[PDB]
Amino acid sequence: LYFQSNMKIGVLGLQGAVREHVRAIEACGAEAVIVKKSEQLEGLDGLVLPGGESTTMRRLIDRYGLMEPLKQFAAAGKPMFGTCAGLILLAKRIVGYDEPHLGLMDITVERNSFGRQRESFEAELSIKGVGDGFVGVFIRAPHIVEAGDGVDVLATYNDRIVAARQGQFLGCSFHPELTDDHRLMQYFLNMVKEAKMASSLK
Ligand SMILES: [Cl-]
């Protein structure tokens, strides 16, 4: 008989702080799973990394022993979407105080707190392969300082990279979950579907 074809997408974070991420994932017809424990990663097709304060990330990763399991998840080819500070977890290099980063994307990132006194703002963005008129909500947005040749730039703001992709990794410095525009989440879910397709065949 038949099984569900719904993708299972994890959200790395605490129950009450990731409601908007759950909603964005579910709005696209995927099942959201709040991930705390590393075993919960095994059944997922993809993972959203919302991030949070550096100290909370440090504690969460250490307390739940997520570092190797996260690296394992990447090695299985499962797509991962870092948003806002979650982008830092995917980076190779950090400018400023050191914090958890897995070295998955060829980018150098810097926390907002380190750069300047940038007040939160909203800007219309043109996202390559996703669409125009996407409202990017920048609240405590990290800065992507540099990106290597293998990184696909999807959007810029004031010539700074604000959305990028490298293989199964997707990253943005804004909060796509704070708009009802589902085009970026759909783009990610498409990556997850393609990756699942591929794993099934070889
Ligand atoms: Cl910015």
Side-chain angles (χ1 to χ4, degrees), residues 2 5 7-18 20-62 64-115 119-201:
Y2 311 89
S5 281
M7 292 302 90
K8 295 162 173 257
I9 309 294
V11 184
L12 221 213
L14 323 164
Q15 291 162 26
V18 303
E20 290 322 295
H21 278 98
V22 165
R23 302 173 183 185
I25 288 164
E26 304 199 326
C28 293
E31 280 162 29
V33 176
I34 301 325
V35 177
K36 162 171 271 199
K37 310 174 164 162
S38 64
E39 163 64 40
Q40 294 189 265
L41 292 173
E42 301 286 354
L44 311 169
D45 300 299
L47 183 67
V48 170
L49 305 165
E53 277 106 356
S54 64
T55 55
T56 303
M57 281 313 314
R58 189 359 79 84
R59 293 184 51 186
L60 187 84
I61 297 324
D62 285 348
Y64 295 113
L66 295 172
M67 177 179 68
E68 296 306 318
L70 285 168
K71 278 172 198 226
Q72 242 160 59
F73 194 80
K78 288 162 172 200
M80 297 171 70
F81 188 4
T83 64
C84 200
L87 178 85
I88 294 160
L89 271 158
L90 307 175
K92 275 219 191 290
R93 304 155 296 268
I94 303 299
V95 173
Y97 292 119
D98 182 40
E99 58 170 288
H101 64 280
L102 307 164
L104 300 179
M105 283 189 83
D106 195 16
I107 57 172
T108 291
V109 298
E110 186 178 333
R111 283 252 170 200
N112 187 262
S113 64
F114 208 72
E119 284 175 352
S120 75
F121 64 100
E122 303 180 2
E124 290 174 7
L125 300 171
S126 168
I127 309 179
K128 199 194 108 221
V130 173
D132 291 330
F134 192 92
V135 180
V137 173
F138 299 81
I139 299 167
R140 297 180 57 175
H143 173 34
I144 286 161
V145 175
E146 164 271 345
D149 185 63
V151 183
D152 192 1
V153 177
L154 306 184
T156 51
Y157 186 73
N158 283 341
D159 302 320
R160 280 140 112 206
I161 296 164
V162 297
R165 171 178 178 180
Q166 192 171 182
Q168 82 200 258
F169 305 113
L170 182 68
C172 68
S173 60
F174 49 94
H175 281 86
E177 85 274 9
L178 297 179
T179 179
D180 273 348
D181 194 330
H182 307 298
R183 285 171 306 160
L184 188 53
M185 187 50 71
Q186 192 56 61
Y187 181 85
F188 179 60
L189 295 189
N190 290 352
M191 289 168 58
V192 168
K193 296 228 216 148
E194 282 187 19
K196 194 187 180 119
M197 191 143 50
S199 86
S200 290
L201 306 175

Short mmCIF file of all heavy atoms in Angstrom, two decimals, residues 19-30 48 81 127 129-136 170 172 174-191 193, unseen atoms left out:
data_model
loop_
_atom_site.label_atom_id
_atom_site.label_comp_id
_atom_site.label_asym_id
_atom_site.label_seq_id
_atom_site.Cartn_x
_atom_site.Cartn_y
_atom_site.Cartn_z
N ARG A 19 7.88 28.74 17.05
CA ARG A 19 6.54 28.61 16.51
C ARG A 19 6.41 29.16 15.11
O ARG A 19 5.73 28.55 14.29
CB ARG A 19 5.51 29.28 17.42
N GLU A 20 7.03 30.31 14.81
CA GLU A 20 6.89 30.87 13.48
C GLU A 20 7.61 30.02 12.42
O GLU A 20 7.15 29.95 11.28
CB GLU A 20 7.34 32.34 13.42
CG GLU A 20 6.44 33.33 14.15
CD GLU A 20 4.95 33.04 14.02
OE1 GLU A 20 4.39 33.12 12.90
OE2 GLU A 20 4.32 32.73 15.06
N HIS A 21 8.70 29.36 12.82
CA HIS A 21 9.43 28.47 11.92
C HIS A 21 8.58 27.24 11.63
O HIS A 21 8.50 26.81 10.49
CB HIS A 21 10.77 28.08 12.54
CG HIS A 21 11.82 29.12 12.35
ND1 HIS A 21 12.15 30.05 13.32
CD2 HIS A 21 12.61 29.40 11.28
CE1 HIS A 21 13.09 30.85 12.85
NE2 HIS A 21 13.39 30.47 11.62
N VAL A 22 7.94 26.70 12.66
CA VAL A 22 7.06 25.54 12.49
C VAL A 22 5.94 25.89 11.53
O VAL A 22 5.61 25.13 10.61
CB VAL A 22 6.47 25.13 13.86
CG1 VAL A 22 5.29 24.19 13.72
CG2 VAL A 22 7.57 24.55 14.69
N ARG A 23 5.35 27.05 11.77
CA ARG A 23 4.27 27.52 10.93
C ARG A 23 4.70 27.68 9.48
O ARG A 23 3.92 27.32 8.61
CB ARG A 23 3.67 28.84 11.44
CG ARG A 23 3.13 28.78 12.87
CD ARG A 23 2.69 30.14 13.44
NE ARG A 23 2.26 30.04 14.84
CZ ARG A 23 1.75 31.06 15.53
NH1 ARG A 23 1.61 32.26 14.97
NH2 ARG A 23 1.38 30.89 16.79
N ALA A 24 5.90 28.19 9.21
CA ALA A 24 6.33 28.40 7.83
C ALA A 24 6.54 27.07 7.12
O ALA A 24 6.18 26.89 5.96
CB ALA A 24 7.59 29.24 7.75
N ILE A 25 7.11 26.11 7.84
CA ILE A 25 7.35 24.79 7.29
C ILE A 25 6.01 24.11 6.99
O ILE A 25 5.81 23.55 5.91
CB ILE A 25 8.10 23.94 8.32
CG1 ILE A 25 9.55 24.39 8.47
CG2 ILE A 25 8.06 22.51 7.88
CD1 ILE A 25 10.25 23.88 9.70
N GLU A 26 5.12 24.15 7.97
CA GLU A 26 3.82 23.49 7.82
C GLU A 26 2.96 24.16 6.77
O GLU A 26 2.18 23.49 6.10
CB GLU A 26 3.13 23.33 9.18
CG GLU A 26 4.07 22.57 10.10
CD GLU A 26 3.42 21.92 11.30
OE1 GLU A 26 2.46 22.50 11.82
OE2 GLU A 26 3.91 20.84 11.73
N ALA A 27 3.13 25.47 6.61
CA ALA A 27 2.40 26.22 5.59
C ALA A 27 2.72 25.67 4.21
O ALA A 27 1.90 25.80 3.30
CB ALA A 27 2.74 27.70 5.66
N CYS A 28 3.90 25.07 4.02
CA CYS A 28 4.27 24.49 2.74
C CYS A 28 3.96 23.00 2.63
O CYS A 28 4.41 22.32 1.71
CB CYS A 28 5.78 24.67 2.50
SG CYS A 28 6.23 26.41 2.29
N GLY A 29 3.20 22.47 3.58
CA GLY A 29 2.84 21.07 3.51
C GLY A 29 3.94 20.12 3.92
O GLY A 29 4.06 19.02 3.40
N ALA A 30 4.78 20.54 4.84
CA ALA A 30 5.79 19.61 5.32
C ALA A 30 5.49 19.47 6.80
O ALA A 30 4.86 20.34 7.39
CB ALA A 30 7.19 20.13 5.08
N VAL A 48 15.95 22.95 9.76
CA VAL A 48 15.97 24.41 9.80
C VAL A 48 16.74 24.77 11.07
O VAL A 48 16.51 24.20 12.15
CB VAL A 48 14.56 24.99 9.72
CG1 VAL A 48 14.56 26.51 10.01
CG2 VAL A 48 13.97 24.72 8.35
N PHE A 81 19.01 24.50 6.44
CA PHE A 81 18.67 25.89 6.20
C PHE A 81 18.94 26.69 7.47
O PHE A 81 18.20 26.56 8.44
CB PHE A 81 17.18 25.95 5.83
CG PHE A 81 16.67 27.30 5.35
CD1 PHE A 81 17.52 28.38 5.17
CD2 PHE A 81 15.32 27.46 5.07
CE1 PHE A 81 17.04 29.58 4.72
CE2 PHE A 81 14.83 28.66 4.62
CZ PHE A 81 15.69 29.73 4.44
N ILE A 127 15.42 37.60 -4.87
CA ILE A 127 16.11 36.36 -4.57
C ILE A 127 16.16 35.44 -5.78
O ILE A 127 15.15 34.93 -6.24
CB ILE A 127 15.46 35.64 -3.37
CG1 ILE A 127 15.32 36.62 -2.19
CG2 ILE A 127 16.31 34.45 -2.97
CD1 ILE A 127 14.67 36.00 -0.98
N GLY A 129 16.23 32.68 -8.30
CA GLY A 129 15.57 31.39 -8.36
C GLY A 129 14.39 31.24 -7.42
O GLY A 129 13.82 30.15 -7.30
N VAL A 130 14.02 32.33 -6.75
CA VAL A 130 12.94 32.30 -5.78
C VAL A 130 11.87 33.33 -6.12
O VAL A 130 10.67 33.04 -6.15
CB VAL A 130 13.52 32.57 -4.38
CG1 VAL A 130 12.43 32.73 -3.33
CG2 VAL A 130 14.51 31.48 -4.03
N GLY A 131 12.30 34.56 -6.38
CA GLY A 131 11.36 35.61 -6.74
C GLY A 131 11.76 36.99 -6.28
O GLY A 131 12.68 37.16 -5.48
N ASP A 132 11.05 37.99 -6.79
CA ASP A 132 11.27 39.38 -6.45
C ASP A 132 10.19 39.83 -5.47
O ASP A 132 9.16 39.19 -5.31
CB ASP A 132 11.17 40.27 -7.70
CG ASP A 132 12.32 40.06 -8.68
OD1 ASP A 132 13.45 39.72 -8.27
OD2 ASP A 132 12.16 40.23 -9.90
N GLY A 133 10.42 40.96 -4.81
CA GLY A 133 9.46 41.51 -3.87
C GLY A 133 9.34 40.71 -2.59
O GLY A 133 8.29 40.74 -1.93
N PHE A 134 10.40 39.98 -2.25
CA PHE A 134 10.43 39.20 -1.01
C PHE A 134 10.82 40.13 0.12
O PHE A 134 11.91 40.72 0.12
CB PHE A 134 11.40 38.02 -1.11
CG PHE A 134 11.23 37.05 0.02
CD1 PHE A 134 10.37 35.97 -0.12
CD2 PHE A 134 11.87 37.25 1.23
CE1 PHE A 134 10.17 35.07 0.94
CE2 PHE A 134 11.68 36.36 2.29
CZ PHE A 134 10.82 35.27 2.14
N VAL A 135 9.95 40.29 1.11
CA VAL A 135 10.30 41.16 2.21
C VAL A 135 11.24 40.49 3.19
O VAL A 135 10.87 39.53 3.88
CB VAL A 135 9.07 41.66 2.98
CG1 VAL A 135 9.52 42.55 4.11
CG2 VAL A 135 8.11 42.39 2.04
N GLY A 136 12.47 40.99 3.24
CA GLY A 136 13.47 40.45 4.13
C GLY A 136 13.35 41.23 5.42
O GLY A 136 13.41 42.46 5.43
N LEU A 170 21.58 25.97 2.74
CA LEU A 170 20.93 27.21 2.40
C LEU A 170 21.06 28.13 3.61
O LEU A 170 20.93 27.70 4.74
CB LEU A 170 19.46 26.96 2.02
CG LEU A 170 18.65 28.17 1.60
CD1 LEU A 170 19.11 28.76 0.27
CD2 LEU A 170 17.15 27.80 1.53
N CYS A 172 20.38 32.38 5.09
CA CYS A 172 19.93 33.75 4.92
C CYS A 172 20.11 34.51 6.24
O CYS A 172 20.00 33.93 7.32
CB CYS A 172 18.52 33.85 4.33
SG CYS A 172 17.22 33.26 5.45
N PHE A 174 18.29 37.15 7.15
CA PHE A 174 17.01 37.73 7.51
C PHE A 174 16.11 36.62 8.07
O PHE A 174 16.57 35.49 8.19
CB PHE A 174 16.36 38.46 6.34
CG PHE A 174 16.32 37.67 5.06
CD1 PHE A 174 15.20 36.92 4.72
CD2 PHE A 174 17.38 37.70 4.18
CE1 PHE A 174 15.14 36.20 3.53
CE2 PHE A 174 17.34 36.98 2.98
CZ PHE A 174 16.23 36.23 2.65
N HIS A 175 14.88 36.96 8.43
CA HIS A 175 13.88 36.06 9.01
C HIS A 175 12.77 35.74 8.01
O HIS A 175 11.72 36.38 8.01
CB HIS A 175 13.19 36.76 10.20
CG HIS A 175 13.99 36.75 11.46
ND1 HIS A 175 14.95 37.69 11.75
CD2 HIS A 175 13.96 35.91 12.52
CE1 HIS A 175 15.48 37.43 12.93
NE2 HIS A 175 14.90 36.35 13.42
N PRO A 176 12.94 34.72 7.18
CA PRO A 176 11.91 34.41 6.19
C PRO A 176 10.62 33.94 6.86
O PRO A 176 9.56 34.03 6.25
CB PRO A 176 12.54 33.28 5.37
CG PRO A 176 13.54 32.67 6.25
CD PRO A 176 14.05 33.76 7.16
N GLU A 177 10.70 33.47 8.10
CA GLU A 177 9.53 33.00 8.82
C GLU A 177 8.62 34.15 9.26
O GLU A 177 7.48 33.90 9.68
CB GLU A 177 9.95 32.18 10.05
CG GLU A 177 10.25 33.03 11.28
CD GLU A 177 11.67 33.56 11.36
OE1 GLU A 177 12.44 33.42 10.38
OE2 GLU A 177 12.02 34.14 12.42
N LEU A 178 9.10 35.38 9.21
CA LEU A 178 8.29 36.54 9.59
C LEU A 178 7.52 37.21 8.44
O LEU A 178 7.19 38.40 8.49
CB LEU A 178 9.14 37.55 10.34
CG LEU A 178 9.68 36.97 11.64
CD1 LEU A 178 10.54 38.01 12.33
CD2 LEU A 178 8.54 36.52 12.54
N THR A 179 7.26 36.44 7.40
CA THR A 179 6.42 36.89 6.30
C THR A 179 5.54 35.71 5.92
O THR A 179 5.89 34.57 6.22
CB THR A 179 7.25 37.36 5.10
OG1 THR A 179 6.38 37.76 4.05
CG2 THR A 179 8.04 36.21 4.50
N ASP A 180 4.41 35.96 5.27
CA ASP A 180 3.53 34.90 4.80
C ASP A 180 3.94 34.50 3.38
O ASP A 180 3.30 33.68 2.73
CB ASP A 180 2.07 35.33 4.87
CG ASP A 180 1.43 35.06 6.24
OD1 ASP A 180 2.01 34.34 7.09
OD2 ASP A 180 0.31 35.54 6.54
N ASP A 181 5.02 35.11 2.89
CA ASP A 181 5.61 34.78 1.60
C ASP A 181 6.37 33.47 1.83
O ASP A 181 7.38 33.45 2.53
CB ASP A 181 6.60 35.87 1.20
CG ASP A 181 7.02 35.80 -0.26
OD1 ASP A 181 7.05 34.70 -0.85
OD2 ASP A 181 7.35 36.84 -0.88
N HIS A 182 5.88 32.38 1.25
CA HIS A 182 6.48 31.05 1.39
C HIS A 182 7.44 30.65 0.28
O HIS A 182 7.86 29.50 0.19
CB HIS A 182 5.36 30.00 1.42
CG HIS A 182 4.29 30.28 2.43
ND1 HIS A 182 4.53 30.34 3.78
CD2 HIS A 182 2.96 30.52 2.28
CE1 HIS A 182 3.41 30.60 4.42
NE2 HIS A 182 2.44 30.71 3.53
N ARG A 183 7.83 31.58 -0.59
CA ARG A 183 8.66 31.19 -1.70
C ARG A 183 10.05 30.68 -1.35
O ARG A 183 10.59 29.80 -2.02
CB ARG A 183 8.73 32.33 -2.72
CG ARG A 183 7.45 32.48 -3.53
CD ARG A 183 7.43 33.74 -4.39
NE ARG A 183 7.68 34.94 -3.59
CZ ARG A 183 8.09 36.10 -4.10
NH1 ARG A 183 8.31 36.22 -5.40
NH2 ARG A 183 8.30 37.14 -3.30
N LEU A 184 10.66 31.20 -0.29
CA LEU A 184 11.99 30.77 0.10
C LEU A 184 11.93 29.40 0.80
O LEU A 184 12.75 28.52 0.55
CB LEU A 184 12.67 31.85 0.94
CG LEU A 184 14.14 31.58 1.24
CD1 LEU A 184 14.91 31.28 -0.04
CD2 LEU A 184 14.75 32.74 2.01
N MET A 185 10.95 29.22 1.66
CA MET A 185 10.72 27.93 2.31
C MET A 185 10.41 26.90 1.22
O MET A 185 10.91 25.78 1.25
CB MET A 185 9.59 28.06 3.33
CG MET A 185 9.37 26.81 4.21
SD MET A 185 11.00 26.12 5.02
CE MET A 185 11.30 27.54 6.30
N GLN A 186 9.60 27.25 0.22
CA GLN A 186 9.27 26.30 -0.84
C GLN A 186 10.55 25.92 -1.58
O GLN A 186 10.74 24.76 -1.92
CB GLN A 186 8.21 26.86 -1.80
CG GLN A 186 7.61 25.82 -2.75
CD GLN A 186 7.00 24.62 -2.01
OE1 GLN A 186 6.07 24.79 -1.22
NE2 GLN A 186 7.54 23.42 -2.24
N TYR A 187 11.41 26.89 -1.85
CA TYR A 187 12.69 26.62 -2.50
C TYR A 187 13.49 25.61 -1.67
O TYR A 187 14.09 24.67 -2.20
CB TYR A 187 13.46 27.93 -2.65
CG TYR A 187 14.80 27.82 -3.33
CD1 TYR A 187 14.91 27.85 -4.72
CD2 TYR A 187 15.96 27.70 -2.59
CE1 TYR A 187 16.14 27.77 -5.34
CE2 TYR A 187 17.18 27.60 -3.20
CZ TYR A 187 17.27 27.64 -4.57
OH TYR A 187 18.52 27.53 -5.11
N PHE A 188 13.52 25.80 -0.35
CA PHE A 188 14.24 24.86 0.50
C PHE A 188 13.60 23.48 0.48
O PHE A 188 14.29 22.48 0.38
CB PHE A 188 14.33 25.37 1.95
CG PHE A 188 15.04 24.41 2.86
CD1 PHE A 188 16.35 24.05 2.62
CD2 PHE A 188 14.39 23.85 3.95
CE1 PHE A 188 17.01 23.15 3.46
CE2 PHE A 188 15.02 22.97 4.79
CZ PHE A 188 16.34 22.60 4.55
N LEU A 189 12.27 23.43 0.57
CA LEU A 189 11.57 22.15 0.57
C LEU A 189 11.82 21.41 -0.75
O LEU A 189 11.88 20.19 -0.78
CB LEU A 189 10.07 22.39 0.76
CG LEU A 189 9.78 22.97 2.14
CD1 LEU A 189 8.27 22.97 2.38
CD2 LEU A 189 10.47 22.20 3.26
N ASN A 190 11.98 22.16 -1.84
CA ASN A 190 12.26 21.55 -3.13
C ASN A 190 13.64 20.90 -3.08
O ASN A 190 13.85 19.82 -3.65
CB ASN A 190 12.16 22.57 -4.29
CG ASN A 190 10.73 23.02 -4.57
OD1 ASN A 190 9.78 22.47 -4.01
ND2 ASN A 190 10.56 24.02 -5.43
N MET A 191 14.59 21.55 -2.41
CA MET A 191 15.93 21.00 -2.24
C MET A 191 15.84 19.71 -1.42
O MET A 191 16.55 18.74 -1.69
CB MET A 191 16.85 21.96 -1.48
CG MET A 191 17.27 23.20 -2.27
SD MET A 191 18.11 24.57 -1.18
CE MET A 191 19.58 23.60 -0.45
N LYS A 193 13.21 17.68 -1.17
CA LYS A 193 12.58 16.65 -2.00
C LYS A 193 13.56 16.03 -2.99
O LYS A 193 13.58 14.81 -3.15
CB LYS A 193 11.37 17.20 -2.74
CG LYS A 193 10.28 17.65 -1.80
CD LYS A 193 8.92 17.11 -2.20
CE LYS A 193 7.83 18.13 -1.91
NZ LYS A 193 6.70 18.05 -2.88
#
